[PDB]
């Protein structure tokens, strides 16, 4: 069993072509069962994402309290399920971005466990 921790890592975080998203999606296992219909990826380094658990706090989506939003822009891809996508055949538009980013965070060390916007 994969730890919320080792989720996020694996959904969202790409440390560094119309395509992009297709690709991904499927190596990090987002179109099995059936296709997730958004994800977003970002491109910072693990230490800048897992930094954003001590900046600003904010509420979440789900009304949870442990949320944090990035001091600063981040470059990030939201990927979306086009039209034409349809189980096991999954299709992504790609948009690449800066926006911050809004993370839930949990655990002893607290790292994200969960995308929650990009703001």
Do not use: W
Not at 15 to 26: I, R, V, W
Not at 63 to 80: A, H, P
Request: charged content about 25%; hydrophobic content about 25%.
């Amino acid at each position: 069993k994969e730890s919320a921790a080792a989720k996020f890592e694996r959904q969202h975080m790409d440390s560094g072509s119309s395509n992009y998203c297709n690709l991904m999606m499927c190596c990090r296992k987002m179109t099995q069962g059936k296709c997730k219909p958004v994800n977003t990826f970002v491109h910072e380094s693990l230490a800048d994402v897992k930094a954003v658990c001590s900046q600003k706090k904010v509420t979440c989506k789900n009304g949870q309290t442990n949320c944090y939003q990035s001091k600063s822009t981040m470059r990030i891809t939201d990927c979306r399920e086009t039209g034409s996508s349809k189980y096991p055949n999954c299709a992504y538009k790609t948009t690449q971005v800066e926006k911050h980013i809004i993370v839930a965070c949990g655990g002893k060390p607290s790292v994200p466990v969960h995308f929650d916007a990009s703001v």
